[PDB]
Structures are given as C-alpha cells and as structure tokens.
Design an enzyme around this catalytic site. Structure first.
Site, short mmCIF file in Angstrom:
data_model
loop_
_atom_site.label_atom_id
_atom_site.label_comp_id
_atom_site.label_asym_id
_atom_site.label_seq_id
_atom_site.Cartn_x
_atom_site.Cartn_y
_atom_site.Cartn_z
N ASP A 32 26.86 -24.69 4.90
CA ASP A 32 26.16 -25.93 4.54
C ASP A 32 26.58 -27.07 5.42
O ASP A 32 26.86 -26.88 6.63
CB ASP A 32 26.62 -26.10 3.02
CG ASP A 32 25.53 -26.84 2.23
OD1 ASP A 32 25.19 -28.00 2.62
OD2 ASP A 32 25.13 -26.25 1.22
N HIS A 64 25.66 -32.96 0.63
CA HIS A 64 25.15 -31.68 0.05
C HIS A 64 26.16 -30.58 -0.03
O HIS A 64 26.27 -29.99 -1.13
CB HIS A 64 23.93 -31.26 0.84
CG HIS A 64 23.09 -30.15 0.40
ND1 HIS A 64 23.32 -28.86 0.84
CD2 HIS A 64 21.98 -30.09 -0.38
CE1 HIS A 64 22.44 -28.06 0.33
NE2 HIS A 64 21.59 -28.77 -0.41
N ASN A 155 12.35 -25.10 -2.39
CA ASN A 155 11.82 -26.11 -3.30
C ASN A 155 10.31 -26.40 -3.08
O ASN A 155 9.86 -27.57 -3.16
CB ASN A 155 12.62 -27.42 -3.21
CG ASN A 155 14.11 -27.23 -3.47
OD1 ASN A 155 14.47 -26.40 -4.32
ND2 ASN A 155 14.87 -28.04 -2.77
N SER A 221 19.10 -25.51 -4.33
CA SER A 221 20.40 -25.64 -3.62
C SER A 221 21.52 -25.69 -4.68
O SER A 221 22.65 -25.29 -4.36
CB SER A 221 20.52 -27.01 -2.89
OG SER A 221 19.83 -26.86 -1.63
#
Ligand SMILES: [Ca+2]
Ligand SMILES: [Ca+2]
Length: 275
Positions: A32, A64, A155, A221
C-alpha cells in the site's frame, strides 16, 4: 482507553484473542502507501519501498496504508483501537505514492519482495481496471509458494450484468473481498461479479491514521485487511496449515448473505474458520 472497532467484533476476532490467539509470529505484508511506524498503536517489523520518489516505507504521506495496517494489527494495549491480529509481524511494502496511485511495476516488485522475504499473508487494498501477465504471474507465484493473498474487490458498484471486480482481485489465486456495513448489508459501492469470494466490514471503519490519529474510512480497502487479519489468526492457531487450508476454512464457514454475485460466500467468521 482502547476501543474495539465494530468490524473486529463483527468478524468474531475477540473470541480468538481471548483464547490467546493473536497472530504471533505470522508475517503480514501491507502492500500500500506505507505505514507510519511512529504511531504508538502500531509495531512495524520491517518492509521496503518500491516508489522511486518516496524511499522510506515508514512514512505514509497518503494515510491509506496506515489505516489498513491498523485494521490488521493495531496493538492490544490501553490506547486507540485493536486490530484483528494484534500480535502479527507487520511489514510496510510501499508501492503507492502520496496521491494513492502507483505503477504496476512497483506493485509487482512489492509482491516479489514479499515472496522472497517469506511473508505469510499479503494484503493488497488496491486495484486497477486492467490486468497484466506479470501481475498474474506474481500473485500466482506467491500462492504457489504458500502465501495467503487477499485483495480489495474494488469500489465500482453495479454495472448492468457485468463483473466490476478489479485487478488483482479478479485472479482466481487471490481472495477478493467485498464490503458490508454493520447490519451485514452490502455497501452500495462494493464491486460485484463471479470473482468475489468473501465479504467483511468496510463502511465507516475506525482505524489508525498517521500523526498519532484515528479516523474512519469506507471502501473495500477497509474490508480486505479484516480478511488478511483473519488469516493471520488462523495461522497462529494452526501453524502447519497450508494457504489452501486457511482459505477453504474462511470460505467454508461464512454467514451466508444474498447472492454470490454480490456477496460471494458471505461474511467471514474467524471463530468458525479457526476450528
Ligand atoms: Ca490499541
Ligand atoms: Ca475469486
């Protein structure tokens, strides 16, 4: 005082914690935007950066990676939150920049790194609309090498009758994770398709943020690290189980929700999966 995010309890992690299972000695790589290793509620064991302009994997300029990492492993102490596998060995594999994007070459370099460094579990809360032979090979090699690979489904919501699951979640070797809310309803944003495997909490998830902060984020996520965390708990209980065994157990003991196109096998239950 420490708070236990709804999602942790929803997947039944506390039952294992109570038993003394918390992911000790399980190596989980968070691929990430990096992880803020300075956060008092996280313990980062190691890692690497594959972002050419951001060489420190322990600086998270996006927020994130830190949020995902806290869902997996925020420490069990008297502050902040609690991760699904608070005793896991957490690795920051930085492949995204501050803007939250990254090149496929970087992601794949990160996957190769995780295989070579003997990670037990890989979490990819990222996705693109297109695949590559190299992306497929890396995930397939990790699974062939015994790693549990978990990814966010995407998403993209619904689109007529097509799959909206992105890559690498689309690949069969990967566990593709969709999001539900606290009532077990699918989030409207959660990607759909025959490649979806399981669901986990992904709406308004409270977790760690860089700079000794905490906040909520929503997305598949946020869902994926509940499953990566789940795999780490299973392996702490059954150290000789193969990745296949961990995966079959997760899939086989879910609470069924609606149609598999939208919910996969349903919501994971780690208590049931751990036998
Ligand atoms: Ca804590
Ligand atoms: Ca699948």
């Amino acid at each position: 005082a420490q708070s236990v995010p709804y999602g942790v309890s929803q997947i039944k992690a506390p039952a294992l914690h109570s038993q003394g299972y918390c992911g000790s000695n399980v190596k989980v790589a968070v691929i990430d935007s990096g992880i803020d290793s300075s956060h008092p509620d996280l313990k980062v064991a190691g890692g690497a950066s594959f972002v050419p302009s951001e060489t420190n994997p322990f600086q998270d300029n996006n927020s994130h990676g830190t949020h995902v990492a806290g869902t997996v492993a925020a420490l069990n102490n008297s502050i902040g939150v609690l991760g699904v596998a608070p005793c896991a060995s957490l690795y920051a594999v930085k492949v995204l920049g501050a803007d939250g994007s990254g090149q496929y070459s970087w992601i794949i370099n990160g996957i190769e790194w995780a295989i070579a460094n003997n990670m037990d579990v890989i979490n990819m809360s990222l996705g693109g609309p297109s695949g590559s032979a190299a992306l497929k090979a890396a995930v397939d090699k990790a699974v062939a090498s015994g790693v549990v690979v978990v990814a966010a489904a995407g998403n993209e919501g619904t689109s007529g009758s097509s799959s909206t699951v992105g890559y690498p979640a689309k690949y069969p070797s990967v566990i593709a994770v969709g999001a539900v809310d606290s009532s077990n309803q699918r989030a409207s944003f959660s990607s759909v398709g025959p490649e979806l495997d399981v669901m986990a909490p992904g709406v308004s998830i409270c977790s760690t943020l860089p700079g000794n902060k905490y906040g909520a984020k929503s997305g598949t996520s946020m869902a994926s690290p509940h499953v990566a965390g789940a795999a780490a708990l299973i392996l702490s209980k059954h150290p000789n189980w193969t990745n296949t065994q961990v995966r079959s157990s997760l899939e086989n003991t879910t609470t069924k929700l609606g149609d598999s196109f939208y919910y996969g096998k349903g919501l994971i239950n780690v208590q049931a999966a751990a036998q």
